A paper describes a structure:
Gram-positive bacteria, including the common wound-infecting Staphylococcus aureus, the virulent food-borne pathogen Listeria monocytogenes, and Streptococcus pneumoniae that causes pneumonia, utilize cholesterol-dependent cytolysins (CDCs) to attack and kill mammalian and human cells. The bacteria produce and release CDCs as water-soluble monomers that attach to cholesterol-containing cell membranes, where they assemble into large, 200–500 Å cytolytic pores. X-ray structures of pneumolysin (PLY) from S. pneumoniae show that the soluble toxin monomers are roughly rod-shaped and consist of four domains (D1-D4). Sequence comparison suggests that all CDCs have the same domain structure and therefore insert into target membranes in essentially the same way.
Residue numbers in the entry: -16 to 471
The structure:
């Protein structure tokens, strides 16, 4: 360069071709590391935890805690807001922590005409294109909403234009963990979902979270040939610097926006079973099998909360609640796309303005995975109705855990051991879930001088069933025993 294409003033006139050229040269001369700019990491924690047991009202839980790491690399960004005027196709966003935190900084400057393509089953190749003179949230939304009307009446009457369903499920352990899985924008929906994390950590409940995305249509932007093509000539280099744009804080443009319906489902249960994964997964498909008790027990102690974005009327977020029957219809609500369904942004993708390279975000965190094993409390019932004097010898161990996680077995005994008991005698011995090595011996006095005692019942390591009833009866010479187990 030199004199030509330059004013004699040495200045670059606002609203001229030279200004747009200076801007174009300014963006192209930017040097930055793509990956470092879009990298964020959450909590970092040590990897040594203790084994612990806690006594619940009706259960003894053994809790194992282990460090796990979550890492995701994706170019798609989930939307959890509805009144967001920043998230329109073609919008220029600033690359900083606000972008990673899913609270973007919008570069609102005089914009040049931009062309948009929209994918729809009925729209012909030629009719899909769309030109907006001054791309803003109102402008692009108008042109899209206008085009939907023409398509709906023309072709959109064929009903089976099914939404694209997408499933994302994950076990909940921490907020940081969920942000990595669902994006940093999840914290808004996570606050309305009421995720109880302490109870998961204490082994009280197990929580699973499900995504549901149904995409009606997506609006796209063609590749930007020159970085300056996006601005009007009124936009000047000193204007971009005034707004803090540089190689350290470069520019990105929303290249695609997904429009449709989105549901966030939360399933927390007090069940400690390890078929919880199978119960929730079977539930989502609505295929409740015919057994009466095996899965219904956990489900009836499972209660559900949901958050709905999109669907019928354009009003933003709907929080719904119930148990299980309604889950099947939530998926069914947005199955069909109508013009009655406006559809709203649920996901968008960004590309760097300088070279149209799609921006990928690297997110990671350490989280404490919680594993739980429960042991139900039980009862030991004794009934003596025999024609003799009987003696009981009932012993067991109580499992406890050390400060360093060692197993501790504390010997226990019925306080009535060895005592002469006579009919009719009954008692109930409450046994907590941490009871191990339960042994029950029963002897009876025969009254015979040469063999005073007769063993009547002797068992070791008796399983801790819900209700066990040992009943003895009969006579000195012919004692009778019954061991009845009630478990369900």
């Amino acid at each position: 360069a030199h004199h030509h294409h330059h004013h004699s003033s040495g200045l670059v006139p606002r609203g001229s071709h030279m200004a747009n050229k200076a801007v174009n040269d300014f963006i192209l001369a930017m040097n930055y590391d793509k990956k470092k700019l879009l990298t964020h990491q959450g909590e970092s924690i040590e990897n040594r935890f203790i084994k612990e047991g806690n006594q619940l009202p009706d259960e003894f839980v053994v809790i194992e805690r282990k460090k796990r790491s979550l890492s995701t690399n994706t170019s798609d960004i989930s939307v959890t807001a509805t009144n967001d005027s920043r998230l329109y196709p073609g919008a220029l966003l600033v690359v900083d922590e606000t972008l990673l935190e899913n609270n973007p900084t919008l570069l609102a400057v005089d914009r040049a005409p931009m062309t948009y393509s929209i994918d729809l089953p009925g729209l012909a190749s030629s009719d899909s294109f769309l030109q907006v003179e001054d791309p803003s949230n109102s402008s692009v939304r108008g042109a899209v909403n206008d085009l939907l009307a023409k398509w709906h009446q023309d072709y959109g009457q064929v009903n089976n234009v099914p939404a694209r369903m997408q499933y994302e499920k994950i076990t909940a352990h921490s907020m940081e963990q969920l942000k990595v899985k669902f994006g940093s924008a999840f914290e808004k929906t996570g606050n309305s979902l009421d995720i109880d994390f302490n109870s998961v950590h204490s082994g009280e409940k197990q929580i699973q979270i499900v995504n549901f995305k149904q995409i009606y249509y997506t609006v796209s932007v063609d590749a930007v040939k020159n970085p300056g093509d996006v601005f009007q000539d009124t936009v000047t280099v000193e204007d971009l610097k005034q707004r803090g744009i540089s190689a350290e804080r470069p520019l990105v443009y929303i290249s695609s926006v997904a429009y449709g319906r989105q549901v966030y489902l939360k399933l927390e249960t007090t069940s400690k079973s390890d078929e919880v994964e199978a119960a929730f997964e079977a539930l989502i498909k609505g295929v409740k099998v015919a057994p009466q008790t095996e899965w219904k027990q956990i489900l009836d102690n499972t209660e559900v909360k949901a958050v709905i974005l999109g669907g019928d009327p354009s009003s933003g977020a709907r929080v719904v609640t119930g148990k299980v029957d309604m889950v099947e219809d939530l998926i069914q609500e947005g199955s069909r796309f109508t013009a009655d369904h406006p559809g709203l942004p649920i996901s968008y993708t960004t590309s760097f303005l300088r070279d149209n390279v799609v921006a990928t975000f690297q997110n990671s965190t350490d989280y404490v995975e919680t594993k739980v094993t429960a042991y139900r409390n039980g009862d030991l019932l004794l009934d003596h109705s025999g024609a003799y004097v009987a003696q009981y010898y009932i012993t067991w161990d109580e499992l406890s855990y050390d400060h360093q996680g060692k197993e501790v077995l504390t010997p226990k005994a019925w306080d009535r051991n060895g005592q002469d008991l006579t009919a009719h005698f009954t008692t109930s011995i409450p046994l907590k879930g941490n009871v191990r090595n339960l042994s029950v011996k029963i002897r009876e006095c025969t009254g015979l001088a040469w063999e005073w005692w007769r063993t009547v019942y002797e068992k070791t390591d008796l399983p801790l069933v819900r209700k066990r009833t040992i009943s003895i009866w009969g006579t000195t010479l012919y004692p009778q025993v019954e061991d009845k187990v009630e478990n369900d």
